[PDB]
């Protein structure tokens, strides 16, 4: 069904070993509520997803990305099941520990896992480790659920997805995993390219998550289908066209930045290529999933 795409996804070469490694660590430390929970956890294959998003990550770093994303999803699920206040408190306890300004309980996995993870990351590359720090707090604090809902125009919806705090985290993490060292200016001039990516990432997600999200809704599939009065299949076909169109915008922006007179850094190029993999990898994942 999906129209052709100029891009080829890629999975990190060490996906298998790393997946065992990381999943194992959590089977060893996280206090799972039950065995069914463990089954659910494993079926998520967090390390595999991470490996599809960051296939160009350095071999000795890819596991950090897997670890960080895994605990963040575990945490995200926890916050979703506790009152806004309790949730807010939960993060208040972890962020200070994540910074390393507070020792972990050591009896509370949510505490020592984050603590040991950030300490090992900072020990490996403090400069870039810190680059990922604030983005993950923003992401964590955004998980305290309240309000949120009702967007009916395409524009507003796409604009809202461009600002997604998680896709922002992904990009920061991507830099750390690949060991990319960019300048403030370089990073700023990447905004547009980044927004286009965050937007593409969301729509492809919606297209594949629409059906399952049916039971009783912030989705591009719903928004457009209403505005255009088309059926779901048609809407999806249209969303795909737009998706492939945005991939061209990506390529166009890249080519332009590279061929630019002011030149394009080696680290900059790696960064842009990296974003392409998040998108190609995100789709690959989205097809074959759940
Ligand atoms: C962005 C994060 C935290 C993980 C990768 C998988 C993913 C995109 C999950 C949520 C789906 C979503 C909100 C898509 C945007 O429409």
From Swiss-Prot:
One term of GO molecular function: aristolochene synthase activity
InterPro entries the UniProt entry points to: Isoprenoid_synthase_dom_sf, Terpene_cyclase-like_2
Effect in UniProt of substituting residue 205 to L: Abolishes catalytic activity
Chain positions recorded as Mg(2+) 3 binding sites: 205, 209, 213
Pathway info: Sesquiterpene biosynthesis; aristolochene biosynthesis; aristolochene from farnesyl diphosphate: step 1/1
Named cofactor requirement(s): Mg(2+)
CDD domains in alphabetical order: Terpene_cyclase_nonplant_C1 (cd00687)
Source organism, top-level taxon: Eukaryota
One GO term of the biological process aspect: isoprenoid biosynthetic process
SUPFAM superfamilies: Terpenoid synthases
Name of the protein in question: Aristolochene synthase
UniProt source species: Penicillium roqueforti
